[PDB]
Design an enzyme around this catalytic site. Structure first.
Site, PDB file in Angstrom:
ATOM      1  N   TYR A 186       8.211 -41.588  54.664  1.00 29.99           N
ATOM      2  CA  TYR A 186       9.489 -42.014  55.159  1.00 29.99           C
ATOM      3  C   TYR A 186      10.085 -43.045  54.234  1.00 29.99           C
ATOM      4  O   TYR A 186      11.304 -42.941  53.898  1.00 29.99           O
ATOM      5  CB  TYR A 186       9.295 -42.652  56.580  1.00 29.99           C
ATOM      6  CG  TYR A 186      10.643 -42.899  57.271  1.00 29.99           C
ATOM      7  CD1 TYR A 186      11.345 -41.869  57.854  1.00 29.99           C
ATOM      8  CD2 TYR A 186      11.151 -44.197  57.348  1.00 29.99           C
ATOM      9  CE1 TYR A 186      12.538 -42.074  58.539  1.00 29.99           C
ATOM     10  CE2 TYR A 186      12.321 -44.451  58.066  1.00 29.99           C
ATOM     11  CZ  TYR A 186      12.990 -43.387  58.655  1.00 29.99           C
ATOM     12  OH  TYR A 186      14.187 -43.632  59.337  1.00 29.99           O
ATOM     13  N   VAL A 219      16.611 -48.943  65.734  1.00 34.00           N
ATOM     14  CA  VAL A 219      17.665 -48.560  66.667  1.00 34.00           C
ATOM     15  C   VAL A 219      17.029 -47.922  67.868  1.00 34.00           C
ATOM     16  O   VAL A 219      16.061 -47.141  67.751  1.00 34.00           O
ATOM     17  CB  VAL A 219      18.594 -47.604  66.029  1.00 34.00           C
ATOM     18  CG1 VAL A 219      19.797 -47.146  66.942  1.00 34.00           C
ATOM     19  CG2 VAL A 219      19.210 -48.109  64.675  1.00 34.00           C
ATOM     20  N   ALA A 220      17.601 -48.285  69.005  1.00 27.98           N
ATOM     21  CA  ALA A 220      17.051 -47.857  70.296  1.00 27.98           C
ATOM     22  C   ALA A 220      17.477 -46.389  70.582  1.00 27.98           C
ATOM     23  O   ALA A 220      18.274 -46.201  71.525  1.00 27.98           O
ATOM     24  CB  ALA A 220      17.537 -48.872  71.422  1.00 27.98           C
ATOM     25  N   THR A 221      16.865 -45.391  69.928  1.00 21.36           N
ATOM     26  CA  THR A 221      16.989 -43.898  70.125  1.00 21.36           C
ATOM     27  C   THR A 221      15.680 -43.135  70.407  1.00 21.36           C
ATOM     28  O   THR A 221      14.587 -43.729  70.465  1.00 21.36           O
ATOM     29  CB  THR A 221      17.377 -43.155  68.814  1.00 21.36           C
ATOM     30  OG1 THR A 221      16.313 -43.092  67.853  1.00 21.36           O
ATOM     31  CG2 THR A 221      18.504 -43.764  68.207  1.00 21.36           C
ATOM     32  N   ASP A 233      19.224 -25.261  60.116  1.00 18.12           N
ATOM     33  CA  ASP A 233      18.148 -26.091  59.637  1.00 18.12           C
ATOM     34  C   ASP A 233      18.711 -26.655  58.304  1.00 18.12           C
ATOM     35  O   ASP A 233      19.121 -25.851  57.375  1.00 18.12           O
ATOM     36  CB  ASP A 233      16.965 -25.154  59.338  1.00 18.12           C
ATOM     37  CG  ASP A 233      15.729 -25.935  58.869  1.00 18.12           C
ATOM     38  OD1 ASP A 233      14.538 -25.467  58.909  1.00 18.12           O
ATOM     39  OD2 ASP A 233      15.958 -27.085  58.406  1.00 18.12           O
ATOM     40  N   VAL A 234      18.711 -28.007  58.196  1.00 15.92           N
ATOM     41  CA  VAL A 234      19.230 -28.596  56.929  1.00 15.92           C
ATOM     42  C   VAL A 234      18.317 -28.309  55.723  1.00 15.92           C
ATOM     43  O   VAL A 234      18.763 -28.407  54.577  1.00 15.92           O
ATOM     44  CB  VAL A 234      19.520 -30.101  57.020  1.00 15.92           C
ATOM     45  CG1 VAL A 234      20.593 -30.363  58.059  1.00 15.92           C
ATOM     46  CG2 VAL A 234      18.299 -30.954  57.225  1.00 15.92           C
ATOM     47  N   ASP A 279      22.855 -28.845  64.066  1.00 17.86           N
ATOM     48  CA  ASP A 279      21.546 -29.347  64.476  1.00 17.86           C
ATOM     49  C   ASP A 279      20.661 -28.103  64.483  1.00 17.86           C
ATOM     50  O   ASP A 279      21.179 -26.976  64.736  1.00 17.86           O
ATOM     51  CB  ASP A 279      21.567 -30.021  65.858  1.00 17.86           C
ATOM     52  CG  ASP A 279      20.424 -30.935  66.045  1.00 17.86           C
ATOM     53  OD1 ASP A 279      19.280 -30.469  66.240  1.00 17.86           O
ATOM     54  OD2 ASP A 279      20.707 -32.201  66.048  1.00 17.86           O
ATOM     55  N   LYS A 283      13.593 -42.454  52.107  1.00 14.04           N
ATOM     56  CA  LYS A 283      14.815 -43.256  52.246  1.00 14.04           C
ATOM     57  C   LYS A 283      15.179 -43.948  50.939  1.00 14.04           C
ATOM     58  O   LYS A 283      16.399 -44.122  50.670  1.00 14.04           O
ATOM     59  CB  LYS A 283      14.613 -44.237  53.432  1.00 14.04           C
ATOM     60  CG  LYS A 283      14.485 -43.492  54.765  1.00 14.04           C
ATOM     61  CD  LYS A 283      15.791 -42.681  55.072  1.00 14.04           C
ATOM     62  CE  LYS A 283      15.603 -42.174  56.553  1.00 14.04           C
ATOM     63  NZ  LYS A 283      16.882 -41.325  56.869  1.00 14.04           N
ATOM     64  N   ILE A 336      21.483 -41.165  66.874  1.00  6.38           N
ATOM     65  CA  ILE A 336      22.530 -41.759  66.125  1.00  6.38           C
ATOM     66  C   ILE A 336      23.640 -40.727  65.844  1.00  6.38           C
ATOM     67  O   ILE A 336      24.863 -41.016  65.904  1.00  6.38           O
ATOM     68  CB  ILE A 336      22.028 -42.419  64.865  1.00  6.38           C
ATOM     69  CG1 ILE A 336      21.112 -43.610  65.199  1.00  6.38           C
ATOM     70  CG2 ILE A 336      23.147 -42.836  63.942  1.00  6.38           C
ATOM     71  CD1 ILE A 336      20.298 -44.161  64.011  1.00  6.38           C
TER      72      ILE A 336
HETATM   73  N1  LIG Z   1      16.350 -44.584  65.144  1.00  3.31           N
HETATM   74  C1  LIG Z   1      16.160 -45.477  64.192  1.00  3.31           C
HETATM   75  O1  LIG Z   1      15.533 -46.585  64.451  1.00  3.31           O
HETATM   76  C2  LIG Z   1      16.570 -45.329  62.788  1.00  3.31           C
HETATM   77  C3  LIG Z   1      16.490 -46.420  61.915  1.00  3.31           C
HETATM   78  C4  LIG Z   1      17.052 -46.286  60.607  1.00  3.31           C
HETATM   79  C5  LIG Z   1      17.478 -45.003  60.188  1.00  3.31           C
HETATM   80  N2  LIG Z   1      17.435 -43.920  61.079  1.00  3.31           N
HETATM   81  C6  LIG Z   1      17.851 -42.566  60.529  1.00  3.31           C
HETATM   82  O2  LIG Z   1      18.992 -42.117  61.209  1.00  3.31           O
HETATM   83  C7  LIG Z   1      18.977 -40.669  61.276  1.00  3.31           C
HETATM   84  C8  LIG Z   1      19.022 -40.234  62.748  1.00  3.31           C
HETATM   85  O3  LIG Z   1      17.947 -40.824  63.475  1.00  3.31           O
HETATM   86  P1  LIG Z   1      17.926 -40.644  65.048  1.00  3.31           P
HETATM   87  O4  LIG Z   1      17.257 -41.911  65.584  1.00  3.31           O
HETATM   88  O5  LIG Z   1      19.253 -40.256  65.526  1.00  3.31           O
HETATM   89  O6  LIG Z   1      16.917 -39.399  65.202  1.00  3.31           O
HETATM   90  P2  LIG Z   1      16.796 -38.358  66.406  1.00  3.31           P
HETATM   91  O7  LIG Z   1      15.401 -37.829  66.318  1.00  3.31           O
HETATM   92  O8  LIG Z   1      17.206 -38.955  67.712  1.00  3.31           O
HETATM   93  O9  LIG Z   1      17.868 -37.240  66.032  1.00  3.31           O
HETATM   94  C9  LIG Z   1      17.626 -36.416  64.881  1.00  3.31           C
HETATM   95  C10 LIG Z   1      18.413 -35.166  65.158  1.00  3.31           C
HETATM   96  O10 LIG Z   1      18.301 -34.428  63.886  1.00  3.31           O
HETATM   97  C11 LIG Z   1      17.961 -33.074  64.201  1.00  3.31           C
HETATM   98  N3  LIG Z   1      17.164 -32.560  63.112  1.00  3.31           N
HETATM   99  C12 LIG Z   1      15.833 -32.964  62.765  1.00  3.31           C
HETATM  100  N4  LIG Z   1      15.489 -32.184  61.697  1.00  3.31           N
HETATM  101  C13 LIG Z   1      16.489 -31.256  61.488  1.00  3.31           C
HETATM  102  C14 LIG Z   1      16.568 -30.195  60.587  1.00  3.31           C
HETATM  103  N5  LIG Z   1      15.587 -29.822  59.746  1.00  3.31           N
HETATM  104  N6  LIG Z   1      17.770 -29.554  60.597  1.00  3.31           N
HETATM  105  C15 LIG Z   1      18.785 -29.782  61.423  1.00  3.31           C
HETATM  106  N7  LIG Z   1      18.710 -30.768  62.376  1.00  3.31           N
HETATM  107  C16 LIG Z   1      17.566 -31.502  62.339  1.00  3.31           C
HETATM  108  C17 LIG Z   1      17.163 -33.143  65.514  1.00  3.31           C
HETATM  109  O11 LIG Z   1      17.097 -31.897  66.202  1.00  3.31           O
HETATM  110  C18 LIG Z   1      17.907 -34.274  66.281  1.00  3.31           C
HETATM  111  O12 LIG Z   1      18.935 -33.806  67.131  1.00  3.31           O
HETATM  112  C19 LIG Z   1      17.693 -40.247  60.576  1.00  3.31           C
HETATM  113  O13 LIG Z   1      17.918 -40.021  59.180  1.00  3.31           O
HETATM  114  C20 LIG Z   1      16.795 -41.492  60.693  1.00  3.31           C
HETATM  115  O14 LIG Z   1      15.804 -41.552  59.713  1.00  3.31           O
HETATM  116  C21 LIG Z   1      17.018 -44.039  62.414  1.00  3.31           C
END
Ligand SMILES: NC(=O)c1ccc[n+]([C@@H]2O[C@H](COP(=O)([O-])OP(=O)(O)OC[C@H]3O[C@@H](n4cnc5c(N)ncnc54)[C@H](O)[C@@H]3O)[C@@H](O)[C@H]2O)c1
Ligand SMILES: NC(=O)c1ccc[n+]([C@@H]2O[C@H](COP(=O)([O-])OP(=O)(O)OC[C@H]3O[C@@H](n4cnc5c(N)ncnc54)[C@H](O)[C@@H]3O)[C@@H](O)[C@H]2O)c1
Ligand SMILES: NC(=O)c1ccc[n+]([C@@H]2O[C@H](COP(=O)([O-])OP(=O)(O)OC[C@H]3O[C@@H](n4cnc5c(N)ncnc54)[C@H](O)[C@@H]3O)[C@@H](O)[C@H]2O)c1
Ligand SMILES: NC(=O)c1ccc[n+]([C@@H]2O[C@H](COP(=O)([O-])OP(=O)(O)OC[C@H]3O[C@@H](n4cnc5c(N)ncnc54)[C@H](O)[C@@H]3O)[C@@H](O)[C@H]2O)c1
Ligand SMILES: [Mg+2]
Ligand SMILES: [Mg+2]
Lengths: 254, 254, 254, 254
Positions: free
Chosen positions: A159, A192-194, A66-67, A42, A163, A23
């Site tokens: 989780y 979401v399709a990721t 790292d966040v 990231d 949230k 996302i």
């Molecule tokens: N994919 C879904 O279905 C979905 C649904 C609702 C909410 N979300 C939320 O959206 C956000 C993004 O999800 P996504 O699907 O893109 O995930 P993703 O795993 O594809 O991407 C997460 C990214 O965050 C980075 N990351 C992880 N921990 C980190 C840290 N400690 N410090 C710095 N970077 C860090 C990773 O390296 C990665 O590039 C997240 O908060 C997730 O919970 C995703």
């Protein structure tokens, strides 16, 4: 109003955590198409190197951090602000771990809460300070339908708790900074399709339930989530603050 | 249903964290008056001793423990279960710290989350294990209206975020344990006259606004929260699970 | 506080609309067992013949009236007040009609809104007048999970709209009457086993989905709803006003 | 995705009820600027004169109709479909009347519900019919913060109940039509500077409270609500259905 530019971000610089994938990467694509410069954040260096090629000149800086490391977030903001004033922050870094509550290792609870909640606060504090100093800014947090309801059938109580905290953290900062011109909102996406969901989407005993409980009958594409983040980050959302926007195909309607 | 007795707790044993003070201590009074025996849990040993003395024969055990110590919570539930099956858990242990977001020491954010959220999960996992094994139990979590709205005028973003996570942790465990007979619900109180709030109630610059923003125009007493906890912990609430019950004088209505 | 009497209604008189069946009838049983005398209000005489024969001496009056007739509600409150001050009102009269939205006849939409919303306003204005003048009262409205979410698979858009209006009706009167001592709350039940749902529960194509989408895997019994109404009507709920209490086996948690 | 064009409505025809004033008229401006043709619907012929002369060639039809007249809405949808397929419907017609609950005449309550709820149903049934047949459409309903919370200090219980019904009507049609490609969402605006609120904004005894209780400290401009309505009507909101989007300056955060 000029509606042909209200959704654009020309002249703005936006920081995005979790920019290397999923996302967050799609939001960077949407923000670059809308005229923003980007600070890509990231933990994974090789993902930032890929992002920065898919993005080119919109990229103002690339910060491996790292966040969960508060001092690295405050450093990242100071590094960014020396390049350009950052007026938009997107907190997309996050993780999801399956665990049954009675068999939860303590470290998994702690890690999920550290990235998804604490790291969102360290980044929002870090980047929000100069926005509050300027009297303008917009933050978009990645919440989830999991901050409102609980997923079925899989269990991951850390989780859901993380949230619920993101949605209230969004709202807290929205209230505290409203008088200082910084809007803070959250998306609450459905599936979401990721890169986060692909392993569970390959287990029919989960995926068939996920589609059956979504009225639109499909997962969202990352771009449908990024278009909503672009609305919240833009001047079109100038009277929107502390809002939790469902972008879930109707999941939270049933 | 025998309405005469449906709100009673006769033959039950309830564990109460935060039993030494405030809402937790009043819930212990209410539960003992309703026939339950009690496991008191609190980090402050003198307040525990003073509660154990007041409650007398209702006390099955007195456990000095820190809810943020997961090992201590697992040991507290083993100790309790050696005395009697614990079928009710009340997670009342919690703290509140005022802080402006951009002047937040990191340790303050961390410790509010550890007590209010992590400790609630450690205690719920520890005591819930035997409830699930028995196929019966009831958990009452102390959420807050601060898990739904943000207080005014004082700032405490960690408290807001912690209470969002409480409300969704409640719901996550309600969903996960519904099919094995353990109900999990939260109260979301408005302002209550306890030691948690006493200093702030002594600041007119806070308190005038608090009362002006509450439709009933008054701060609740601990007994008015403990009566609602007794409802949710009793068989009268046998179809209530995953609910967040506002007990706030109407605060969240405006 | 004396917890051993705080849920009782001794000395009260409660008017209950929809007293002839289902939840309203069971609320009558619960309130009689709790010491209240009753004003039974229903538009079905033959159901009041049966309900009055069972409730015996707890009945202070039985009134055949249609809640959609504002003038009959104002007259019912005057008839009740002539027998005893009414300090509790339960708005349980309600209907549900299944209908495809595009082929809805105007009459179905109007019928369902008239009974479930307008009638609840006419009864609340009628009975609430003397409560406001006494500075004391409690009103319990039958909302529904259908004021929060949308049922599946069956469609009944007028029912969902009416229960969204019930929830906000409740909160509006809670806010306006809070300074004058009248509390107003709603229950939001999940599926309950009453005549309103009997022939729907006999359609496997609905009933299997209803149970599958309830975490506790069963409908509620009317006594489970009546115990929650007794809580809200009693002094135990003295700090609860404008609340929407889910009693739904966890349905709205997913 | 092409984010450059995802917010456009090129080729679309949108019907707007309440187009003569306020938010509806500003939505017509935003929609015209985004490429749509318009069907203007309002009871006020003199307001329609003014609106049509401003919007010029963007107007495919102007219809003087009362949304409470179900037959008139069915006839308007047929009149509009004979000019162009209507793929967007905005239900902005609505009224607000101040009334204390115990002084409420029956005709006030009925007519607020008739415009705000029933007319939204009649208009959505009428225009929604062709959308569902085509398997595509978007509807945006004007809800309000008053569907979520209760305003203060003024009383208008019919408005609060009408807006609770709007939010659940929106959700019910989103669920029923999701498989047929028609999205249905609502805005929940805070106070907006339009003719509906002009008289109340000119009463310091209301207005100072309204600003005090809004974190942003100001009312919203109609354009700030129209940009949100444009987001929800456009393909950018392709994964958004049944959502209630707060656009309230943070009102509902406190
Ligand atoms: N994919 C879904 O279905 C979905 C649904 C609702 C909410 N979300 C939320 O959206 C956000 C993004 O999800 P996504 O699907 O893109 O995930 P993703 O795993 O594809 O991407 C997460 C990214 O965050 C980075 N990351 C992880 N921990 C980190 C840290 N400690 N410090 C710095 N970077 C860090 C990773 O390296 C990665 O590039 C997240 O908060 C997730 O919970 C995703
Ligand atoms: N007082 C209010 O206005 C109010 C409103 C809404 C919710 N709450 C919540 O209700 C709960 C109880 O609040 P209260 O007013 O009774 O507070 P309190 O301060 O009176 O009592 C809290 C008790 O928790 C114990 N405690 C604190 N941290 C602990 C730890 N790490 N391990 C073990 N015990 C610990 C304390 O020693 C004390 O006995 C808290 O979660 C609080 O957030 C309070
Ligand atoms: N049964 C459920 O699953 C369920 C779920 C959630 C909420 N509810 C709500 O609870 C309330 C009670 O439901 P129930 O299951 O007891 O229904 P029911 O049909 O068993 O009883 C309704 C009673 O109201 C009376 N009534 C109906 N319209 C009336 C009118 N115009 N004037 C006077 N009396 C009238 C009926 O004659 C009947 O005695 C309703 O508001 C319903 O919407 C029911
Ligand atoms: N202004 C606000 O502060 C505010 C806040 C939240 C939500 N809303 C909602 O937004 C919507 C539009 O409000 P507004 O501020 O633009 O109001 P407005 O009074 O400026 O405009 C309403 C328009 O609707 C038309 N209308 C009223 N009743 C009608 C009927 N029966 N049939 C056809 N047309 C009719 C009016 O003639 C007018 O042109 C309403 O639903 C209102 O409840 C307004
Ligand atoms: Mg749901
Ligand atoms: Mg509020």
């Amino acid at each position: 109003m000029d509606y042909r530019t209200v959704f654009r971000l020309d002249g703005a610089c936006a920081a995005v955590t979790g920019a290397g994938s999923g996302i967050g990467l799609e939001i960077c694509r949407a923000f670059a198409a809308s005229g923003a410069r980007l600070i890509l954040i990231d933990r994974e260096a090789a993902a930032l190197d890929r992002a920065a090629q898919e993005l080119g000149a919109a990229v103002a800086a690339r910060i491996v951090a790292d966040v969960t490391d508060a001092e690295a977030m405050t450093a990242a903001a100071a590094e960014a602000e020396a390049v350009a004033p950052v007026s938009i922050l997107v907190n997309s870094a996050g993780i999801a771990r399956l665990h049954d509550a009675l068999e939860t290792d303590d470290a998994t609870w702690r890690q999920v809460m550290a990235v998804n909640v604490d790291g969102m606060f360290w980044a929002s504090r870090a980047f929000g300070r100069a926005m509050v100093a300027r009297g303008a800014g917009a933050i978009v947090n990645l919440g989830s339908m999991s901050g409102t309801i609980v997923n079925r059938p899989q269990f991951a109580s850390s989780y859901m708790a993380s949230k619920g905290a993101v949605h209230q953290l969004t709202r807290a900062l929205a209230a505290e900074w409203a008088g200082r011109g910084v809007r803070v909102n959250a998306l609450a996406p459905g599936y979401v399709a990721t890169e986060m969901t692909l392993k569970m989407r390959e287990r029919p005993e989960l995926f068939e339930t996920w589609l059956d409980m979504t009225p639109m009958g499909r997962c969202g594409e990352p771009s449908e989530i990024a278009a909503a983040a672009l609305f919240l980050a833009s001047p079109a959302a100038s009277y929107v603050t502390g809002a939790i926007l469902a972008v879930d195909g109707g999941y939270t309607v049933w």
